[PDB]
Symmetry: none
Subunit: 293 residues, 5 copies
């Protein structure tokens, strides 16, 4: 069975354009019913049509959850980036598919993200905004949790050279200090960071990520005892997971978005002043003709 | 990961209008919860709504730290400049965003500040105070740490001409002599200035800025051994930082506020009589019709 | 950066009521510490509270250096003028703020001083002492180093008329002959005056002011080789300076206090018998009902 | 700037008890050095302590020049008047401070001198010497160069009545005939007096006073071409001067000491037999109980 | 100013031992030059040293004018009295200093002369010559021009008693008749005496003394039109003068030497046969043990 590391590993929901709508292009009759994309699930039984998507459609077709954020960026309080998302989906989050375990042999994982394109637009361009083209490039590699890596893909050669010279891909995240109790209560502390810096394939071994609270009478943010939040993540040490975060193409670092918005304030990560999560946008907003784009 | 040069490079806190308040316009439900600006983080889990701000709002929305200074100027002991700040935010500090490194190719950085406007107000005006309009103009440029620069922006043409003729933007700061010990103790000396004057992009290489003390039994100001101060800054030589200071539009010099208030007295910077930090206000308080405004 | 012409151009020290005292009304916590005027710099880190002062307070709040002179006048050997200084500060020295350069366009400078008030006190008063009221009036003007000037302010109309008719404000000082050597040694001669008489804005171009000695084995006063004195001043030809001296309201002449007390004796300024520095007190001690007060 | 009429108008030298001595009560450290009256100018830099003196001390503290005359009277060839000078300073010379000009409005000037006191000493005293008490009284007045005057002060009522009845104070001096050449040579003639008699405030307009020679091959006294003497005085028509001479309290006439000792012989002032300069001593040496003392 | 009655009232020339000689004990440097009695006026500027003399020196030190008469008596045609003058100066002329005026109150005047001493030299001496000792005694008094007088001094008691009994001191002189013309011509008549006999203090009111001629084509003595003689004296009615003559101690009469040698012949004073001027020598040449010496 698939294991959850940071995201629900429902390979159908993220790849098949919803399941509950009327026409439901992903739904088809079971035995001899209507052809694919024609049944009415509210009026007749029909089954998944085995639809799989590739390319930029997958980024856009991830609006099955996160309706609030999608509406927030599209004609909401995030109106600025509306042009980018409405044309390329979530064009700045990196999805890292991972396959199998047993660290004795070495796993296999690919990383998918976007890279701004700048070969056009009157060479010599050094603006504070990028041109609207991103090529949806990807990187995939194989290796053991310790030591060497082998790279492949169609990423820009400048990033491939950096990754080959480095020899590994690193993962860094911010670990808000937390206290775990017997009944599952998770309360955050006031001064603890324990900055993460490990190989990507050794990051599958540890699950000390804070990622919000779930307790009661907590002194930081949460106060309601009976809610369904998402506390500290799971280990998943030799399984098939979907690691989600952002990929800083400048240094080849896959960064996890470990803390949430209410837990990115000074009295909660004081020892380490920086939050690694917000680092992708420097590969978009301060570009020039060369660099690594 | 973002690097800290003089300011916390938390790109969300300075651009998203707080995160912990009740309504919390920057907070939105994670999967299908309340729309953006409607969750209660103390009563339900919700996530950053990807809100980004541009214009004069960003200057005003920087009241998430520095509550003491904001209250000091607004109806406090800094009551004089209350009219300016309450309408334009911190209208005299310059924020210099910087992107990427590897000085072989050259970085890219922009500078944001304010410039008094004087085209109105009965031509021939030569008062000791400026008119209340500042246009929040910006300058951005690209170049290597050594030699030539290329400029662009919407700054007044008089300043653009000076910057193009000069060919570079310089950084100057006051370096109070300090002694660094093994245990991190930093004690200031009695006579050492070592005035800074370097290209802006070569200022990212050196971190000899004094910027307060952190030791114990210090003979200058500090006496308490266990406090969390901010000692000498960090290098950040090929990273994405946020350099903060003031920009003197008269000479195109980006000035760092290197020493703090307790360390701007005669027995602490004696060899160099002037403190470069307090130089912005000459572009506001002694203006005339032309000049560089 | 600010330039030094005759005084340290530390715009905070002269305008913010000290920085090192316990309560330290000008000091405030950095991020969320105690409010302004409440931190203890010897026990906790806190920063300048952006306090700026206007009016008669600025004159009194200049006791951060010059403790010896302040104590000399207040209940010392200068006991006579103790009543005036303790109520109005240094009420006879003129401070001349100056802004920007490039003499092609023309600078902008204001002058601040005191003027005795005599409209009261039984009209017909022609005593040898003035009444204790001085109104702390100011004059500001704009113009190029050559030729015309434009005046404004709230000074008494009699002085404004004289300044407009004259068309310029002149600067005069006594230049004790000096010899400058390679190693910085400055020795005064026996007969050289070279009386100064130039427009105020052309006085920023030349720095031939003697202003004490710094050498060794000097035959005039100084004998110790290793001391920190203040030798001949600096040019500062297109910068923001703070010119300090006295303003003779009778002729509208801004007079620099060029020589010091040990160098105002006959064998050191013989060719010119008068010392222009001591000329302010004729606007206080020999007044009548009209005049220019 | 102050103007010289007959005396160096150095208001500090005559009022501040020297400047070059070791202890130097008038010298104080500049910024934070030793307190007033404690610096060593030959070993450390220190500045005028703003010391001002009033009363009989000012008369005694004028020994900073005129060392030869002071030693001549004190235990020298002027041994007779040694008792008077050692106790009251120069008790027979009159100092007349003057303030401002523009004769359209009228100036303001005070006169300071000594008056013998005779109310004691067995009424009926008509000796040829006065009693040793002089009260250092003063007279000050205001008026235009033409016509009326207004008097005030604490002088004996007998002199005040005479001055009010007269309506003006007159100045008289002896003008030795002189010839002035292009190169500054001044040679005295053999028969020319041109006795002076004018209002005090109209005496500031003319500068025909002989007051010694400065030429070469002169047939009267001087023979050396290269000396620094004091030739004919200056006009100073609307300025702040210090007129020095003697005040004959008998007639209220301020008398200038116009010619020097070598030029008070018969072949140099023949037309007028009397020299007005030596007229003060009749108010000391031939007094009685009443008179104007 | 001093007034001239019969003698130049130059109080310095008669009291300070010349001014033009090389060593010039009465001359001293002005500001810091050579000490008193050491300057060379022909080679350097120096000023009166305020030297005043008392005693028998003043009589001898009156050789600054009258060189002809001094040489006439000393080893000349007046060889007889050479012993007296060379040891006591002009020991038979009386000098009468006078002070102030306004005859309503009364003036004050002293008289200085010589009195032969005869208490020694074998009591019973009645020779035709006096012994060589004269004691340089003086008399001073106060009184109004009319009526009573008050006497004091150290004169011999016999003369004091006579003066007190008389109650006044009288002045007598011979008035040669003269005619005064518009152009200043003064011509003497042939028969007019108008003998003077008045109180000393009322003699200051009238100036009808002949005292030589100044005209042209005069029939008495003078023939040259252009000469500088000394015609009829001046009034000086309420001033400070120096009355010069001889004092006849026998009757206490101060006698003026009114006519000169060429005008003491019979056809010029015919009505009064005696000339009062030559009356002093009867107090020297016909003395005895008692009398009034
Ligand atoms: C349905 C279920 C979806 C779909 C179709 C997508 N997401 Fe999202 N996601 C989902 C859940 C329940 C959560 C909570 C995380 C948890 O339970 O542990 C998330 C979280 C994220 C995050 C935060 C990652 C982290 O905190 O470590 C991101 C960045 C994210 N999801 C992105 C994302 C994108 C880009 C999608 C479409 C391309 C997308 N999700 C779809 C549930 C669901
Ligand atoms: C939250 C965290 C913020 C926010 C939202 C702003 N600042 Fe400020 N700032 C912050 C810290 C922790 C510090 C300490 C500096 C350090 O840790 O090294 C500062 C400092 C400054 C300074 C001093 C710069 C220097 O000493 O070199 C300035 C001038 C400053 N901050 C300005 C500033 C402005 C103008 C802001 C809003 C527009 C602002 N800050 C927001 C923390 C925080
Ligand atoms: C701290 C630093 C101060 C403060 C707060 C004031 N002064 Fe003063 N001042 C200071 C220095 C180091 C010097 C030396 C001058 C030099 O380095 O070149 C001075 C000098 C003066 C002078 C002399 C001016 C001259 O010689 O040309 C004056 C007249 C003077 N300072 C006046 C003054 C007044 C009136 C102040 C308060 C209102 C004042 N100072 C404050 C240093 C400092
Ligand atoms: C220092 C400089 C002093 C001081 C402290 C005093 N005097 Fe004197 N004085 C000085 C100079 C250089 C001169 C020359 C005059 C000139 O340059 O024109 C004088 C002159 C006088 C005179 C003569 C006045 C005349 O000729 O018209 C007098 C009477 C005089 N000075 C008096 C005087 C007194 C009474 C002082 C102390 C109370 C005194 N001076 C101080 C220079 C200096
Ligand atoms: C310099 C000037 C002197 C000095 C130092 C003395 N005298 Fe003499 N004197 C002087 C003048 C110019 C005149 C002319 C008189 C005039 O101008 O009206 C005189 C006159 C006399 C007289 C005659 C008095 C008379 O005619 O009424 C006498 C008796 C006399 N002078 C005496 C005298 C004595 C005793 C002196 C020294 C002790 C002396 N003089 C000095 C000019 C000068
Ligand atoms: C929550 C999101 C999400 C989930 C869950 C997910 N994917 Fe994807 N997948 C993506 C996105 C986004 C892309 C876009 C890659 C591109 O556009 O090039 C992608 C692309 C792919 C590709 C294309 C690779 C290529 O070279 O074209 C494959 C294969 C794939 N996914 C397999 C899987 C499998 C197998 C699972 C589950 C068992 C899975 N994915 C689950 C988001 C997801
Ligand atoms: C993957 C690309 C990408 C990333 C990552 C990204 N942006 Fe942008 N951003 C854009 C583009 C494209 C635009 C211009 C949109 C347009 O012109 O329509 C833009 C515009 C903006 C603007 C407005 C610029 C203007 O001139 O008005 C702001 C502000 C901004 N972004 C902030 C941010 C911040 C803050 C981050 C990171 C926290 C970020 N962006 C991350 C692509 C990106
Ligand atoms: C502590 C303050 C601060 C931080 C941190 C900060 N900014 Fe800004 N930023 C500002 C201010 C102030 C402005 C105002 C510029 C204006 O008003 O024109 C601004 C403006 C901008 C703009 C607008 C440029 C334009 O032309 O309109 C962009 C893009 C931007 N920031 C990007 C970023 C990114 C990306 C980060 C972090 C990864 C970041 N900023 C972090 C203060 C900050
Ligand atoms: C970016 C613009 C700006 C800067 C920088 C600035 N000021 Fe001002 N200042 C103003 C304005 C605008 C006013 C007038 C406010 C009003 O009229 O309401 C003012 C007013 C003042 C006043 C009061 C003037 C009066 O007539 O009462 C003082 C004092 C003052 N400033 C001091 C300073 C000092 C000191 C500095 C530098 C250390 C400084 N200011 C920097 C904009 C500025
Ligand atoms: C050493 C002394 C000193 C220094 C340094 C100094 N000032 Fe001042 N300043 C004064 C004094 C004194 C006044 C008093 C004026 C008054 O009372 O009217 C004053 C007044 C002012 C005013 C008030 C003008 C008005 O019309 O009310 C302004 C604005 C000002 N200063 C600006 C500055 C600036 C900007 C700087 C430095 C960058 C500076 N000053 C540095 C002494 C100083
Ligand atoms: C700006 C005004 C001002 C200036 C400039 C000034 N004074 Fe004064 N001075 C005063 C006042 C006011 C008093 C009277 C103080 C009192 O009555 O309490 C005074 C009093 C005096 C007194 C004592 C007067 C008395 O009757 O006892 C002396 C002496 C004196 N000043 C000397 C000087 C000298 C010397 C100077 C110049 C070198 C000078 N002053 C400059 C204002 C001034
Ligand atoms: C060369 C001598 C000299 C000079 C120069 C001089 N004074 Fe005086 N001053 C005196 C003397 C002597 C007195 C003594 C008055 C007394 O004792 O009553 C005096 C007294 C005074 C007084 C006291 C008035 C009173 O009523 O008590 C004042 C005020 C004064 N001076 C002002 C000045 C000023 C202002 C200057 C120059 C700008 C100056 N003086 C220059 C010699 C001088
Ligand atoms: C032309 C001659 C002459 C002139 C002019 C003159 N004196 Fe004298 N004075 C004398 C003589 C002679 C004595 C000698 C008295 C004695 O020896 O006792 C004398 C003595 C004195 C004495 C001494 C009195 C005593 O009791 O010892 C005084 C005082 C005096 N004079 C004052 C003056 C004054 C004041 C002036 C002018 C302003 C003046 N004199 C002008 C000739 C003169």
């Amino acid at each position: 069975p698939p294991y959850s590391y940071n995201h629900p590993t429902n390979c159908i929901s993220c790849h098949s354009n919803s399941t509950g709508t009327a026409n439901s292009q992903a739904l088809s009759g079971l035995t001899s019913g209507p052809a694919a994309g024609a049944c009415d699930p509210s009026q007749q039984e029909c089954v998944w049509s085995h639809q799989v998507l590739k390319g930029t459609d997958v980024w856009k077709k991830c609006i099955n959850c996160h309706v609030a954020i999608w509406n927030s960026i599209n004609s909401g309080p995030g109106n600025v980036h509306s042009g980018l998302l409405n044309s390329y989906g979530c064009a700045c989050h990196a999805v890292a598919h991972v396959g199998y375990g047993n660290p004795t042999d070495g796993y296999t994982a690919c990383i998918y993200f976007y890279v701004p394109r700048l070969s056009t637009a009157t060479p010599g361009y050094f603006g504070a905004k990028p041109t609207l083209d991103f090529r949806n490039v990807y990187i995939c590699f194989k290796g053991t949790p310790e030591g060497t890596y082998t790279f492949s893909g169609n990423a820009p050669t400048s990033l491939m050279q950096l990754l080959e010279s480095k020899g590994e891909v690193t993962v860094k995240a911010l670990l808000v200090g937390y206290d775990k109790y017997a009944n599952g209560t998770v309360k955050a502390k006031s001064s603890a960071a324990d900055f993460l810096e490990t190989d990507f394939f050794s990051a599958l071994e540890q699950a000390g990520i804070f990622r919000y609270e779930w307790g009661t009478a907590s002194g930081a943010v949460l106060k309601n005892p009976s809610v369904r939040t998402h506390p500290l993540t799971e280990e998943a040490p030799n399984g098939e997971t979907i690691v989600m975060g952002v990929f800083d193409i400048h240094t080849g670092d896959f960064i996890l978005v470990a803390p949430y918005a209410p837990y990115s304030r000074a009295p909660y990560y004081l020892p380490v002043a920086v939050n690694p999560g917000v680092a992708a946008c420097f590969n978009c907003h301060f570009v020039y003709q060369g660099q690594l784009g």
